[PDB]
């Protein structure tokens with residue numbers, strides 16, 4: 001069974017924790033990756049009821065199981081805070097335009 005389901009993509013906790021770690025590392029180092037420069041702040045315009053505090057940061061998680069290193073980030077994201085706390089897993093799948101919805 002999936003720990004997180006983003007549209008048709010299925011993630012375990014281990015996929016999440018690996019993505020997140022990659023992301024937080026760049027963050028800590030003040031480096032970015034991709035044309036969209038990940039990781040970058042997540043404003044929470046959506047108003048998700050996250051249980052950890054802001055600031056929030058978004059980082060792609062890939063259905064391939066690989067760590068994001070550039071190119072298309074797909075639709076799914078991990079959201080972490082300043083404390084390397086998992087805020088949640090979100091996606092553009094099933095959300096209009098460029099909005100997000102949560103993975104279930």
Ligand SMILES: Nc1nc2c(ncn2[C@@H]2O[C@H](CO)[C@@H](OP(=O)(O)O)[C@H]2O)c(=O)[nH]1
Nearest residue numbers: 036040041042043044045046058098099100
């Ligand atoms: N929809 C949305 N986009 C945000 C938010 N904070 C920053 N953005 C950025 O604005 C861009 C337009 O959605 C996004 O790129 P991305 O979602 O394709 O990765 C996202 O990184 C937020 O709270 N909601």
Ligand SMILES: [Ca+2]
Nearest residue numbers: 011012015065
């Ligand atoms: Ca996996």
